[PDB]
Amino acid sequence: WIHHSTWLHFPGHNLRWILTFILLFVLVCEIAEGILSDGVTESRHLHLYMPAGMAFMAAITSVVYYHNIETSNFPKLLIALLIYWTLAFITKTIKFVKFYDHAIGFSQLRFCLTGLLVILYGMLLLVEVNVIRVRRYIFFKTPREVKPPEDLQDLGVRFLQPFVNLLSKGTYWWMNAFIKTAHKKPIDLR
Amino acid sequence: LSSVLHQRAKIPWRACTKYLSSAGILLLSLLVFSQLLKHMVLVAIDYWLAKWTD
Amino acid sequence: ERRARFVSKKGNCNVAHKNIREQGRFLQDVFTTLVDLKWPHTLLIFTMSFLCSWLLFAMVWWLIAFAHGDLAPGEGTNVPCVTSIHSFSSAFLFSIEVQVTIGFGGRMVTEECPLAILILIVQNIVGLMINAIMLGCIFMKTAQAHRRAETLIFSKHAVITLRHGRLCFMLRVGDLRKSMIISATIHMQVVRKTTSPEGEVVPLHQVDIPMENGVGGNSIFLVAPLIIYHVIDSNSPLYDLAPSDLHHHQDLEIIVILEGVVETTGITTQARTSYLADEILWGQRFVPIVAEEDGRYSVDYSKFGNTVKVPTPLCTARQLDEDRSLL
Amino acid sequence: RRARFVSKKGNCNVAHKNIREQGRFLQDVFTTLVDLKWPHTLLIFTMSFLCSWLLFAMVWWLIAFAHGDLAPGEGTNVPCVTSIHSFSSAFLFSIEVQVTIGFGGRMVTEECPLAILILIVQNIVGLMINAIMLGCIFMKTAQAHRRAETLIFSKHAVITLRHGRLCFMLRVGDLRKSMIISATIHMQVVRKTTSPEGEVVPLHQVDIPMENGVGGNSIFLVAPLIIYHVIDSNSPLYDLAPSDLHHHQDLEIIVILEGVVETTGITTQARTSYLADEILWGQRFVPIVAEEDGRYSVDYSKFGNTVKVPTPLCTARQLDEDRSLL
Amino acid sequence: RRARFVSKKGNCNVAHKNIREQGRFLQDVFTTLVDLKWPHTLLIFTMSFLCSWLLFAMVWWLIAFAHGDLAPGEGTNVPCVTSIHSFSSAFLFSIEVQVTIGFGGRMVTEECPLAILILIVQNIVGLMINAIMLGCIFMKTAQAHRRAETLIFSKHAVITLRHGRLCFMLRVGDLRKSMIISATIHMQVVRKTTSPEGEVVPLHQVDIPMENGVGGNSIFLVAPLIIYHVIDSNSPLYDLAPSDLHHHQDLEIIVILEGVVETTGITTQARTSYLADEILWGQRFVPIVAEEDGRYSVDYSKFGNTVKVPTPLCTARQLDEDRSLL
Amino acid sequence: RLILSSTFRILADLLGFAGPLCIFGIVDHLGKENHVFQPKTQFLGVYFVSSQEFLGNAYVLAVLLFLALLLQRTFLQASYYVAIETGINLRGAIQTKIYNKIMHMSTSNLSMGEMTAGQICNLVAIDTNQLMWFFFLCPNLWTMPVQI
Amino acid sequence: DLQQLDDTTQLPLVSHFAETVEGLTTIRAFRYEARFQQKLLEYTDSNNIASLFLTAANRWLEVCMEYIGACVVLIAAATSISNSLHRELSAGLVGLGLT
């Protein structure tokens, strides 16, 4: 569906949210790409309109999982992403090979989008993998200990804009609460 | 409850009351009329700028 | 300037348990947490999975069907992977029966398809377990939810009167339930930041209080709300206490919890309630609620929490021993 | 008449009026069916299960008329469900889904999306509907293994003198063959009181000691027991006489026996008492035990048979002080 | 090393042997599966159902060969199973029944009675096969809900002078938020005692009171507390000497912490002990209870923090002996 | 820290300056009266669109606008936040070094007269605050010509 | 509130500095430099921490409106294009709207 114990961050908190957001942009373009290609042919021909439209949902869902999988520290539970990133590499690559087999080239946009997709997807599997090098949740013997921030230990830290996710770092949802509670209760030095 | 609410009063009327009273009437509407026209003239610049472009 | 209380007046006691090593949790906790959900929230929880149970495996068949060539337009050349499966819409129907054992009949599986033979097995055993956990979830939820209601009412403010000569702290606990609380043991505990005479500093040392029942045991028979006459004496820690130190700024915390078991279910329950120094009105007496009617005994529960003053000596409990010695 | 704290059969009747609380939550309704009797439970779900066979079925016929399948003749479009002819027949189509039979004479095809929602609409409903049934049957069966209690006490109360000091007695005897584990039966006397400092108690609740061997609430019941109650200086009835037993009195002795039945594994309680008039001063309980050649038999039928035995007509103080002066 | 009666974590390794022949009833197998690991539980019934899907399916492929249907071609002979052609279809035929799919492509006729025998033969089995597993997952529902160990126990013991009185103590706190209803702790010392009449107790079990205010084994924990057992003249520890703190010392203490688990409704027992090596004479625990604006604060790091304090290194009997002189 | 703030700021306006450019494209597709779409390519029975045409679609350019607009604003807004954070800390270090130097200063009459308390007050008040603003507005110095 | 809170917190830090200037020799004479330096951090914490939150809300209110303002572009932009796509809206209205 205290909190200081629920604020540890996995490795690459930036390299993922940057990459994951980078995926939302180019993929959203493909959502236009299938729409444009379907204009001429009378039949809808969703075969280029459905996947990205479905895929765009997935990254949105996947990102929410990472925020949830990090807010509650269950580093073993970071296998679904491992089992989803890995599989997507198989399917995405196949399209590149078959398109390259038909001498599609880069003159067409779709092959250009797919080629970009492989690189972006490739980063996701590797970036996720680097976590296993650090936390070593499964397929490892000794889980190296991880500690929450020493400043975060004290309950006397509130303007925790630094202590928030990269997607949070800019959205200022960190200050959302202190803005929210101010509507009724006066704000004092406490 | 009330203490925050009593503090949380922007007081536009009182601010308008003293400021306008100092202003008077002649220069008062003159400020209102002149400012509105210039912004209106600015907007009208675009429509012609659109028209000749069209 | 509110002071922290070890137990809330409503019993929602909160203690900041920091500097805590992260205990390992397993996914079964979520499965346990699944049982812990609410009936409306759980209703969607299984339904969303049950819906995805129909769809997700079904999509495999639609992919599977396209492989054997049946997904193409009509052609009697090949033997279909599944009979009369045409579109991904029809894909749901073949699965919809399978997970639900419906067996509509027209969409029939056949032979000569190894992958399909795995489809009718893998999606099959999955459904049986899928319904099993949901059936198991309801099995535990139905019995347990009956004991999620608290129907015992303590007294918000405490009174300090004198009964049978001695002054004894009083509190009235009223039962809002028709069902009886078997094995009613209510233990009274006092908490203070008493630095030990040996020198040690105890920030929250807890001291129990004898209930002064008819047999000295914590056991009590609950029919109508009565007064737990906690006698204060030399053995009692409250001997040196006085209403002088009854201000909101005194490190004196009183805790009472009434252990028992719901008669209908047998599920043991506890009632957490606490009182501080400020909330207690010294020299107040309880207003009787039990009324003598010809037909039954009437409970004036609306008058349970009414504090009415009565002539009460204001001498110190330690000092009050002088009156007996002098006389 | 006279107000009794607890009835002889139990189920103490107390008018707990002046109630300010939530009227009802849906949890009560689920509790209400779960606590109903077997014949009532059988019909209620039967009505519920029958309702599913009807309420959803109403949707199909309306779904059918919309597609125009019900009209006679070969239709230009394949219907929402194959071989649906009339609302009477549609009940057969509905019965296949919720009950999960799926004969096949009725058939559902594609190209009818509104039906696709309907199939899902009743699919989850029936499974949930069936789910309540499995839950409901599970609940009623578990507790009903201990739906009754058969541990009785003598109708009248008996007082006599045992081991020099007089005492008030009672009779303990149970019927169910299975034993009750950890019997801690505490008895209490209730009477009107006004405190020496003036506080008025309409009926104070103070227990009496069962005077067992270990002086504790524990009891092991395998034979008709007579749990005595020693009258001591601190005893509430230490100023009691065989005279004040008239119907107009303030005494009220009630005993509640805690514990769980071994087979049940669930705690059960039994409330029994006896008023002032019910007692018979100077009467001893009839020995109901008798060990035969092979086994021992309990003559329970004479449990309440009170046999008068000579006793001093002096109060505990009026006896102890007389004994002390003796 | 030395033999142990209970490990620190709570394994309590005891070498119980010389045991007579146990029953080893076959019904215990279901209990083993009932307590089986969830992954193992996942596989166990699955293979059984997979075997069940095949075991009866094994019989059918023979049945078809018997009734003269597996042969190529359509003759006058009605098959034992409609449209039964080969093992692949046959292996589907069973899958229809034992899971009640009811495909319909394989239909049933009254050609051969053994088919009616076969249909019933597995018909009860499946309703039983699911019955065994449905109860199995039902058992594992509450069993997983247990999650026993959710508290803490002191790694080492402390012996400080409380209220001027010499007394040992320990510490414990609850890591989980859920409460422990009806706390009960018993402290006992497993030491090799001897009797005056020669009985050399191997590891005599002698308990020590918890010195609670009410003078009972009942407690209440919401915070990390220290149970202080007053070491007085009426306890065997009155002959203790700090010189006996070696791992080779012939003494030990055992603590049992019962209590009703509020959420689970099943009591969990805490098995713990401390060796003489863990005894830190003249050390005092640093308090971890703290106050904050929201609520009280607890420093779980400071559970094992020890602050040494001046302690008279004499015998409690001798210290009390000089206490009268002092 | 400051360099990253400017680096964000530089790409903030650089991405931002395309804002007007999209308007130039948006009108042109509207500016073509026929506005009839035909990709003129189908490699394998499915038409594939060329790059030069994908960036010519009026609706497509609009979608790129909202995506760019939100992206351009969010990075631009942070650029102020990063700098003002670095400056705010710099107030502390300057103040501490000011106070730390104060405690070890000599109390000569010229050191007290020629260095009056107000001058000591003014520097801690006027200077560091001014230096705070100079850092608070430093990137604009390194950015305003770029956008210009 | 915050600006009032910040401005109020601005007075002591300067004031404590003035006292140090006013009582320099004695503060060193008592050799209590350890205590006073704690106060300087104590004061500097108030002004600095107040400033960050003061800067924080200023950035947020800009962002929340800006993105809310941003949608006002696309919503109008799509609307104008559809009018120009089908309703034969002239470029003149199209150009002005984005402007």
mmCIF file of all heavy atoms in Angstrom, chain D residues 232-254, unseen atoms left out:
data_model
loop_
_atom_site.group_PDB
_atom_site.id
_atom_site.type_symbol
_atom_site.label_atom_id
_atom_site.label_comp_id
_atom_site.label_asym_id
_atom_site.label_seq_id
_atom_site.Cartn_x
_atom_site.Cartn_y
_atom_site.Cartn_z
ATOM 1 N N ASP D 232 -13.877 -16.606 58.598
ATOM 2 C CA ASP D 232 -12.815 -16.100 59.450
ATOM 3 C C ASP D 232 -13.139 -14.690 59.941
ATOM 4 O O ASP D 232 -14.218 -14.147 59.697
ATOM 5 C CB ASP D 232 -11.482 -16.121 58.706
ATOM 6 N N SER D 233 -12.179 -14.091 60.650
ATOM 7 C CA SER D 233 -12.368 -12.739 61.167
ATOM 8 C C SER D 233 -12.515 -11.731 60.036
ATOM 9 O O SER D 233 -13.326 -10.802 60.123
ATOM 10 C CB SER D 233 -11.199 -12.360 62.074
ATOM 11 N N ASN D 234 -11.733 -11.894 58.968
ATOM 12 C CA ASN D 234 -11.830 -10.987 57.831
ATOM 13 C C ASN D 234 -12.938 -11.390 56.867
ATOM 14 O O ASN D 234 -13.137 -10.712 55.854
ATOM 15 C CB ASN D 234 -10.490 -10.922 57.096
ATOM 16 N N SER D 235 -13.650 -12.473 57.154
ATOM 17 C CA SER D 235 -14.697 -12.941 56.255
ATOM 18 C C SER D 235 -15.854 -11.949 56.223
ATOM 19 O O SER D 235 -16.254 -11.437 57.274
ATOM 20 C CB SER D 235 -15.198 -14.314 56.685
ATOM 21 N N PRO D 236 -16.405 -11.647 55.047
ATOM 22 C CA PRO D 236 -17.547 -10.722 54.980
ATOM 23 C C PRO D 236 -18.745 -11.159 55.798
ATOM 24 O O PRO D 236 -19.438 -10.301 56.355
ATOM 25 C CB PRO D 236 -17.876 -10.692 53.484
ATOM 26 C CG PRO D 236 -16.565 -10.969 52.827
ATOM 27 C CD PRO D 236 -15.870 -11.963 53.714
ATOM 28 N N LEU D 237 -19.019 -12.453 55.886
ATOM 29 C CA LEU D 237 -20.140 -12.935 56.678
ATOM 30 C C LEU D 237 -19.750 -13.263 58.112
ATOM 31 O O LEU D 237 -20.426 -14.077 58.748
ATOM 32 C CB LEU D 237 -20.763 -14.163 56.014
ATOM 33 N N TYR D 238 -18.679 -12.660 58.634
ATOM 34 C CA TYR D 238 -18.251 -12.956 59.997
ATOM 35 C C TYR D 238 -19.229 -12.431 61.037
ATOM 36 O O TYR D 238 -19.125 -12.800 62.211
ATOM 37 C CB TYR D 238 -16.862 -12.376 60.257
ATOM 38 N N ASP D 239 -20.166 -11.580 60.637
ATOM 39 C CA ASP D 239 -21.218 -11.090 61.513
ATOM 40 C C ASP D 239 -22.575 -11.619 61.066
ATOM 41 O O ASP D 239 -23.610 -10.984 61.272
ATOM 42 C CB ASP D 239 -21.216 -9.564 61.558
ATOM 43 N N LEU D 240 -22.585 -12.798 60.453
ATOM 44 C CA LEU D 240 -23.797 -13.380 59.901
ATOM 45 C C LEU D 240 -24.360 -14.437 60.839
ATOM 46 O O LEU D 240 -23.628 -15.137 61.542
ATOM 47 C CB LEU D 240 -23.537 -13.999 58.524
ATOM 48 N N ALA D 241 -25.682 -14.548 60.823
ATOM 49 C CA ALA D 241 -26.438 -15.456 61.665
ATOM 50 C C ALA D 241 -27.371 -16.290 60.804
ATOM 51 O O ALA D 241 -27.716 -15.886 59.690
ATOM 52 C CB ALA D 241 -27.259 -14.688 62.710
ATOM 53 N N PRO D 242 -27.799 -17.457 61.292
ATOM 54 C CA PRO D 242 -28.798 -18.234 60.541
ATOM 55 C C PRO D 242 -30.173 -17.587 60.518
ATOM 56 O O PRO D 242 -31.119 -18.201 60.009
ATOM 57 C CB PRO D 242 -28.820 -19.582 61.275
ATOM 58 C CG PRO D 242 -28.333 -19.273 62.649
ATOM 59 C CD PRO D 242 -27.325 -18.176 62.489
ATOM 60 N N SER D 243 -30.315 -16.372 61.051
ATOM 61 C CA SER D 243 -31.599 -15.690 61.134
ATOM 62 C C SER D 243 -31.850 -14.720 59.987
ATOM 63 O O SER D 243 -32.975 -14.667 59.479
ATOM 64 C CB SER D 243 -31.702 -14.931 62.461
ATOM 65 N N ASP D 244 -30.837 -13.961 59.561
ATOM 66 C CA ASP D 244 -31.049 -12.906 58.575
ATOM 67 C C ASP D 244 -31.281 -13.442 57.167
ATOM 68 O O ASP D 244 -31.280 -12.657 56.214
ATOM 69 C CB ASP D 244 -29.857 -11.947 58.570
ATOM 70 N N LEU D 245 -31.479 -14.741 57.011
ATOM 71 C CA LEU D 245 -31.672 -15.341 55.693
ATOM 72 C C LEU D 245 -33.018 -15.009 55.062
ATOM 73 O O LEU D 245 -33.297 -15.584 54.002
ATOM 74 C CB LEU D 245 -31.511 -16.858 55.789
ATOM 75 N N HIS D 246 -33.850 -14.142 55.635
ATOM 76 C CA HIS D 246 -35.165 -13.877 55.075
ATOM 77 C C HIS D 246 -35.048 -13.292 53.667
ATOM 78 O O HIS D 246 -33.985 -12.845 53.231
ATOM 79 C CB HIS D 246 -35.948 -12.926 55.976
ATOM 80 N N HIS D 247 -36.177 -13.304 52.954
ATOM 81 C CA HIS D 247 -36.195 -12.819 51.577
ATOM 82 C C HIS D 247 -35.772 -11.357 51.494
ATOM 83 O O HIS D 247 -35.280 -10.905 50.454
ATOM 84 C CB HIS D 247 -37.584 -13.011 50.972
ATOM 85 N N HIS D 248 -35.964 -10.599 52.573
ATOM 86 C CA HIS D 248 -35.504 -9.212 52.639
ATOM 87 C C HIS D 248 -34.110 -9.196 53.260
ATOM 88 O O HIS D 248 -33.928 -9.304 54.475
ATOM 89 C CB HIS D 248 -36.482 -8.355 53.432
ATOM 90 N N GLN D 249 -33.104 -9.061 52.400
ATOM 91 C CA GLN D 249 -31.718 -9.048 52.842
ATOM 92 C C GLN D 249 -30.867 -8.383 51.771
ATOM 93 O O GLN D 249 -31.361 -8.081 50.683
ATOM 94 C CB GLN D 249 -31.211 -10.465 53.126
ATOM 95 N N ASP D 250 -29.594 -8.149 52.092
ATOM 96 C CA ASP D 250 -28.656 -7.527 51.167
ATOM 97 C C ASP D 250 -27.582 -8.492 50.672
ATOM 98 O O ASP D 250 -26.853 -8.163 49.730
ATOM 99 C CB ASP D 250 -28.002 -6.307 51.819
ATOM 100 N N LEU D 251 -27.478 -9.673 51.272
ATOM 101 C CA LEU D 251 -26.460 -10.633 50.879
ATOM 102 C C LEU D 251 -26.715 -11.140 49.466
ATOM 103 O O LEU D 251 -27.862 -11.319 49.051
ATOM 104 C CB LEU D 251 -26.428 -11.807 51.856
ATOM 105 N N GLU D 252 -25.633 -11.366 48.727
ATOM 106 C CA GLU D 252 -25.732 -11.959 47.396
ATOM 107 C C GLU D 252 -24.401 -12.612 47.068
ATOM 108 O O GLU D 252 -23.424 -11.913 46.783
ATOM 109 C CB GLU D 252 -26.095 -10.910 46.349
ATOM 110 N N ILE D 253 -24.363 -13.939 47.098
ATOM 111 C CA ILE D 253 -23.146 -14.703 46.857
ATOM 112 C C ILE D 253 -23.204 -15.237 45.436
ATOM 113 O O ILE D 253 -24.159 -15.929 45.063
ATOM 114 C CB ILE D 253 -22.986 -15.848 47.866
ATOM 115 N N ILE D 254 -22.185 -14.921 44.648
ATOM 116 C CA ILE D 254 -22.088 -15.367 43.264
ATOM 117 C C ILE D 254 -20.717 -15.993 43.050
ATOM 118 O O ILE D 254 -19.707 -15.486 43.556
ATOM 119 C CB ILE D 254 -22.324 -14.203 42.288
#
